Amino acid sequence: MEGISIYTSDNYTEEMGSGDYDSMKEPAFREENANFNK
């Protein structure tokens, strides 16, 4: 697991737009609905 090892990243920019589509929730991990898409 070296994928957690921090690399030097700063002075870079990405502009915050807006928290819009829910914007504060987290995983249900797997399938939420078996099959009721219709």
């Binding site: 957690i4 921090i6 990243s9 700063d10 002075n11 990405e14 915050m16 928290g19 589509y21 829910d22």
Partner: protein, 68 residues
């Protein structure tokens, strides 16, 4: 641009229920302050949303590029 040392993230806020079918790509930056930060830009030419790395579609996305 010389990358410096400070606890900051590109996006400080995350979008959540965005449409996986409406995004073109993801861009991931793991910065010391944030779990994992993903930035996605919408199709055609629309807004850019920064996504939570734990979104279900992201759960699908990462795991599928990994193992399937």
């Amino acid at each position: 641009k010389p990358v410096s040392l400070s606890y900051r993230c590109p996006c400080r806020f995350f979008e959540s229920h965005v449409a996986r079918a409406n995004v073109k790509h993801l861009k991931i930056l793991n910065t010391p302050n944030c779990a994992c930060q993903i930035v996605a830009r919408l199709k055609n030419n629309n807004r850019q949303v920064c996504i939570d790395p734990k979104l279900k579609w992201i759960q699908e996305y990462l795991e599928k590029c990994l193992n399937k």
